[PDB]
Design a binder for this molecule. Structure first.
Ligand SMILES: [K+]
Ligand SMILES: [K+]
Ligand SMILES: [Zn+2]
Ligand SMILES: [Zn+2]
Ligand SMILES: [Zn+2]
Ligand SMILES: [Zn+2]
Ligand SMILES: [Zn+2]
Lengths: 634, 635
C-alpha cells in the first residue's frame, strides 16, 4: 500500500511529461502505465524497458479509457485501413488489457510492412491490436470462456488490483528456507499435488484427482495436512490440463479459495473442457459431485494465462517461468526463482523428452537450478519403450488383422492425450493407403479438444503448425474422421461395417468407451488397443492385466457378466510420458546440473528403482518422499 | 460438561460398593480421581479399584474428599501425637491438589510403623494421605522454591488439571490413518533438539532446546515458524532431560501463549528450572536480550506434570506415554509413545548412555510394541569409539599428578549437571584412597545446587550409589574435599593461591564463571585444561580442543584483548554422557522389539550419515537422516 507509492514515484521521475500518464496500476504480476496519448505506445518503450530492468518489474503501457474509441466507431476505422485485402473474420474487444482482437485470413496485411498498419490502428482508436490468424474451426469452449471474461470486466479488474497489491509488497520475513510437501501423486499415479512453502509464500504445484473410481481417501489430495490452510495459499500452478493434475482445482474454489491460478492458455481451455465433462459424467450416472458449473467459472476468472518463457512475479519472493513440457497441448514445466535465486527449483509435471508429431520435445535449458522434481511414470529398468517407427508398424499390423477379420478396433483415449497423436498418424496412414480406407469415429470430446489445438497453433510443434497453416494439410478436418455424439448413433456404429473407434475415458473407466466396450467385447473378431498408460485400479489396467470376466450395467441397469473374447493388444512406444531411457538421458542433459532430485508421479516400485539408478549412475542425491512427507530445498 | 466423561463415571460407580462413600469422580490430567468421604478406604490396597482400572484401561487414584480433610494446623497437632518424637520430623508440607501430607524425618520407618500401622492411623485421624520421605542431607533451594510455587497456585492448578483431563479422555475425533514427525531442531546438528509429532487428532512436542552455542537467532532457536506448528493446537510437550539443548526454549512457548502441559521426570523438572534460571541470570548479568523471563519459567512449572519411569499415562485421546531411563543425566528419559491402535508406536531416546555409570543405571532397551525408533547420534562415525573408563580414569590421574606437581591448576569446564556429577564421584574415591595428592577441590555454586537435587532424588540414582549414600552414609557430595564458591572475590583468591582442582559452570566455554577462570590461567604453561563432555561446533571449547591457541575477547575493563595459550590441553575420551560408536551400534542390536524404521537426530552432519550408512549395511533396517525442516511419515 505504501511501498508501492515509491515504485510509482520512481516511474514518474524517470518519465517525460510528453508521455501523458493517466494513472499507474499494479495489476497482477505486472505494472500498468495508462496514457492519454496512444501514440506513446507506438514509440519504442526502450526508456520503459530501461525503467523495467531498473526496478526489476514487468511494465505494460495501455491507453486510458478516456482515449479509447467506442467499439461501434472503432470497427469502421479498421475496415478503412486494411482494407478488404487481409479479409477479416472477427473483431473483439477487451476492456481490461485495452486490446482489439483481430482475426483475419492473412494477418500479415493487418500488421503492415514495418508494423505500420497496426501503428495506424493504435494511433486512430487507442486500442492495442492483437493480430491473430483465423481458426479453421471455432471452439465452443473458448467462445464460452470469452463470454465469461467479457461479462465479468469490473470484477476481474478488482481481482487483478488486489492480487497485484499482494504481489509487489516487500517480503515480510527473510528467506532462510524453502520446503516442499507432498500432498498427492507420490509413490502413486493420481492426485498430483505439491506444496511449496517459504516464510513468506504458500504455493500449490498441480492440484489433481485420482480418476480411478475408488475411495475418497485415495482420490483427493491431502488438504487435511496441518501445514496447508486455504487462506494462506498465494497461488496455484497447473502444469497441464489432465485431471491427474488439475481436477481438484474447482474444489478449491468451492471451499472458498480466492487467489490466482497460473497456466498456459491451452491448459486453461482444455482444463475447463475436462472439468465440465466431469460434471456431465456425474449428472449422467446420478453421482453426487461437489463442484457445480459456477466453481469452474470462478476458476476461470482467477486464471492468469502465461506464455512459455514469460517470466512472472507471482509472490514477493517468487518468480515463475513456464517451459514447454511437450506432453499435451500447452503442457508446461514450472521453474521457480526463489528469493535471491541461489536455490531455484523446477517441477516437470507430466513430460516427454522426444519430439512427437504434435509437440516439440520438453525443454532442458533453464536459469540456475538447485532442485529438480520429475515424474517417474515409466521409471524402472523394465520400462524401455520401442522406437516410434516400431510402435507404428505394430499398430498397422493389428488394425489390418482386425479389418481382415471383419471387426472393429476400439481405442479408448482421454479427450486430449494420445488421441491427437493417434489422429495425425491414422489420417496419414489411411490417406496414403498404408491402412485400408475405413471410417474413423471420434467422440465429441476429442473433436472439441482438437478445435482448441488448431486454435492455439503456437503451442503445437513447428513442423505440424507449418503443415497446417502454410501447407494447408490439416489432419483434423479430414473426411476420414466422423464426429460422434449420442448413444443412438453409436448403436449403428458397432452394428455397422469394420471401422476404427476413438472414445473417451482413456483407461476404460465409465464414459463412452465403456459402452462401446460392452457392445464389442464378446466378439473375437473385434480388438481393443491400448496406447496410453493404464493406471492401477482402473478397469483399463484390469482388462490389460488379463481380466476377462467383467460385471456391468445392462441395456437398462441390470448387472450382467461379460465374457471378453475380443483381442487385447497393448502398443508400447506411444505414451505422453518419456520412457525409462529418456528419463535417464534427461538427467544427463540439463541446463544447470541439479544437486537434488525428487521423484513423483510414479508407481511405488518404479520410483525407488529410478532413484537408486539415478544416484549410482550420476551420484546425485534423489529423494523419494511418501505422500505426507516434506523435503527441504533451502 | 461432556457425555463421554459421564459414561465412564457411571461404569466406575456401578462397580463400586456402598462402603466406598464416593463423593465425586474427577478427571484430573492423565488420571481419573475418586474422592471418598471415608479415608479408611485409602488404606486398603484397592484390589477392586485396580480391577476397574484395567477393565477401562484408565488410571484410577483414590483420595479423601475436601469434606473429610482436617485443617492443616489441626492435622500437624494430631501427627506429633503419633510418632511421638523418636522419628525426628524435619518439615511437614501439604498438597490441596493430591490431598497429601508430606513428611520428612530422620527415621521414616517410625512414621510408617510396622505393618504400615502408624501411617494408616494418620489417614484415619486426619483424612490426609501420608507421603513419607527421609530428610535429605542437603536441602535444595530450587526444590523448595518450586514447592512454594505449587502451593500458592493450587487454586489455579486444580482448574488446569480439570480442563486438561477433560480434553484428554475424549473419544478420538478422526481415524488414525497416518502419523508424521517434523524435525524442528537438532537434526544434522547438536543444538536445538525439538521434534513435532502429529496425528490427525494430536500435536506433541518432543524436546524444545536452545543451541547454547550463542550466535544468530536463526541458529539458536528451533523453527516454530513452520506452517504446521500452532501453539493453540499443541496438546503436550515432552522433555527428556534437563539439558538446555533439549529444554532451554520451553519458557518461550509459555511466553507466547501456550496453555498446555509439560511431561517429564521429577528431577528433570527440577534441574530444568535451575539451568533455565541460570541462563536468564547470565543474559541479564551480561546485557543481552532473551525472549523469556522468570515470569515464564514459573508458568512452565505450574503446567508441568512429573512422571516416574515406566508410568503409563494418557497424554491425548490417541496417545499413551511412558518414560524409560535414558541413563544420560539424573532423570534423563526416553519416550515411548503408544499411538492409536498401537500398531505404529515410536520411541524417542533423547540423549542416552547405553552403559552403567557410577552415577546412573544403563539406558533402557526393553520396550513394548514399536515400529519407529528415533535415536541420538552425537558419536556416530567409526572414528568415535571411546576407550573404557578404567583407562580414562588412569589417563586422568596421570594428567593430574603431572600438572599438580608442576605448580599448576587443573581446570575442568562442566555444565551444572552432567559430567560434573560423575567426575565428583570418581574424584572423591581417588583422593580418599590417596591415589591423588590431597588438595582442596573448588566447585561453582551451580554444581553444588545441582548436587542438592541429586541427593533429594535417590530413587533415580544407580542402585549401587543409592545404597552407598542412603544405607551406608558414604555420601560423596559432602566430603570436606569440596568447597562451594560464591562471589568473585573467592575466585581471585584461588588463582593467586596455591595449585589445586577447579570445576566451573557452562561446559563448552560460553561464558559465566567458566570463562572467568580461563581468563586467568591459560597463559601459564604450568596449568592445563581437560575436556570430558562433547564439544559442539559453535564454541570456544571446540576451537581450543582442535589445536587453536589465539583468541579475541574482553578484559576487566571490557577491553578487546589477545590471549595466547601455552598450557596443556588434554581431552579425556571415554566419559561423555553419550554412548559412543560401539554402544550406539550395540543398542540397535539389543533393542527389545526390532524397529522397522529408524530416524537419527542430535548428531553432527557427517557422523549422522556415517552411522545411518552403517546401520542399514549391518542390520538392513531403513534409516532416515532428515534435514532440519523435513517431515518423515511414521504410519
Ligand atoms: K489444514
Ligand atoms: K507457525
Ligand atoms: Zn499425470
Ligand atoms: Zn498428463
Ligand atoms: Zn510457422
Ligand atoms: Zn544431554
Ligand atoms: Zn543433547
Amino acid at each position: 500500500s505504501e511501498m508501492l507509492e515509491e515504485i510509482k514515484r520512481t516511474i514518474m521521475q524517470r518519465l517525460p511529461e510528453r508521455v501523458q500518464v493517466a494513472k499507474v496500476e499494479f495489476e497482477g504480476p505486472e505494472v500498468v502505465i495508462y496514457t492519454k496519448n496512444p501514440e506513446i505506445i507506438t514509440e519504442n518503450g526502450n526508456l520503459i524497458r530501461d525503467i523495467a530492468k531498473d526496478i526489476r518489474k514487468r511494465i505494460i503501457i495501455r491507453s486510458d479509457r478516456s482515449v479509447l474509441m467506442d467499439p461501434e466507431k472503432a470497427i469502421r476505422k479498421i475496415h478503412e485501413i486494411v482494407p478488404e485485402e487481409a479479409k477479416i473474420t472477427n473483431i473483439s474487444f477487451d476492456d481490461v488489457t485495452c486490446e482489439v482482437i483481430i482475426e483475419a485470413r492473412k494477418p500479415g496485411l493487418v500488421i503492415g510492412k514495418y508494423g505500420s498498419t497496426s501503428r495506424e490502428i493504435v494511433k486512430n482508436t487507442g486500442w492495442a491490436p492483437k493480430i491473430l490468424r483465423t481458426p479453421p474451426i471455432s471452439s465452443e469452449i473458448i467462445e464460452r470462456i470469452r463470454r465469461t471474461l467479457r461479462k465479468n470486466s469490473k470484477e476481474r479488474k478488482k481481482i487483478l488490483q488486489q492480487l497485484g497489491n499482494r504481489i509487489h509488497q516487500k517480503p515480510k520475513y527473510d528467506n532462510d528456507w524453502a520446503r516442499l510437501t507432498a500432498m498427492g501423486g507420490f509413490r502413486e499415479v493420481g492426485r498430483s499435488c505439491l506444496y511449496l512453502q517459504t516464510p513468506n509464500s504458500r504455493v500449490l504445484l498441480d492440484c489433481g484427482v485420482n480418476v480411478a473410481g475408488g475411495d475418497d481417501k485415495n482420490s483427493y489430495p491431502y488438504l487435511n495436512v496441518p501445514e496447508f490452510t486455504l487462506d494462506s495459499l498465494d497461488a496455484v500452478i497447473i502444469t497441464h490440463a489432465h485431471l491427474d493434475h488439475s481436477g481438484f482445482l474447482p474444489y478449491l474454489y468451492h471451499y472458498g479459495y480466492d487467489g490466482p491460478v497460473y497456466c498456459t492458455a491451452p491448459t486453461r481451455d482444455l482444463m475447463t473442457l475436462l472439468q465440465l465433462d466431469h460434471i456431465d459424467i456425474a449428472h449422467r450416472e446420478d453421482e453426487p459431485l461437489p463442484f457445480n458449473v459456477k466453481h469452474v467459472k470462478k476458476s476461470v476468472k482467477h486464471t492468469i494465462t502465461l506464455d512459455y518463457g514469460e517470466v512472472t512475479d507471482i509472490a514477493p519472493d517468487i518468480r515463475l517461468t513456464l517451459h514447454n513440457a511437450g506432453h499435451i497441448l500447452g503442457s508446461a514445466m514450472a521453474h521457480l526463482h526463489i528469493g535471491d535465486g541461489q536455490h531455484n527449483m523446477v517441477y516437470t509435471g507430466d513430460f516427454k523428452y522426444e519430439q512427437s508429431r504434435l509437440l516439440e520435445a520438453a525443454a532442458n535449458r533453464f536459469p540456475r537450478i538447485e532442485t529438480l522434481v520429475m515424474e517417474s511414470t515409466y521409471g524402472g529398468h523394465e520400462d524401455v519403450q520401442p522406437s516410434r517407427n516400431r510402435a507404428e508398424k505394430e499398430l498397422v499390423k493389428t488394425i489390418y488383422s482386425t479389418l481382415r477379420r471383419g471387426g472393429k478396433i476400439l481405442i479408448p483415449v482421454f479427450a486430449v492425450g494420445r488421441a491427437q497423436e493417434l489422429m495425425i498418424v491414422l489420417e496419414e496412414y489411411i490417406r496414403t493407403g498404408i491402412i485400408d480406407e475405413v471410417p474413423v469415429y471420434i467422440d465429441g470430446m476429442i473433436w472439441e479438444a482438437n478445435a482448441i489445438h488448431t486454435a492455439r497453433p503456437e503451442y503445437l510443434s513447428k513442423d505440424l503448425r507449418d503443415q497446417i497453416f502454410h501447407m494447408g494439410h490439416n489432419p483434423f478436418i479430414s473426411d476420414i474422421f466422423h464426429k460422434v455424439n449420442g448413444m443412438d448413433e453409436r448403436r449403428e456404429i458397432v452394428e455397422g461395417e469394420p471401422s476404427i473407434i476413438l472414445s473417451t475415458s482413456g483407461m476404460l473407466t465409465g464414459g463412452n468407451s465403456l459402452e462401446y466396450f460392452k457392445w464389442l467385447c464378446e466378439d473375437p473378431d473385434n480388438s481393443l488397443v491400448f496406447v496410453g498408460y493404464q493406471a492401477e485400479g482402473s478397469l483399463g489396467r484390469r482388462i490389460q492385466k488379463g481380466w476377462k470376466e467383467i460385471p456391468l450395467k445392462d441395456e437398462d441397469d441390470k448387472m450382467r457378466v461379460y465374457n471378453v473374447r475380443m483381442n487385447i493388444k497393448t502398443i508400447e512406444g506411444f505414451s505422453g510420458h518419456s520412457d525409462r531411457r529418456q528419463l535417464m538421458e534427461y538427467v544427463k542433459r540439463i541446463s544447470p546440473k541439479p544437486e537434488k532430485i525428487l521423484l513423483c508421479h510414479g508407481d511405488n516400485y518404479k520410483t525407488l528403482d529410478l532413484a537408486s539408478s539415478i544416484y549410482r549412475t550420476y551420484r546425485i542425491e534423489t529423494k523419494t518422499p511418501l505422500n505426507l512427507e516434506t523435503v527441504r530445498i533451502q
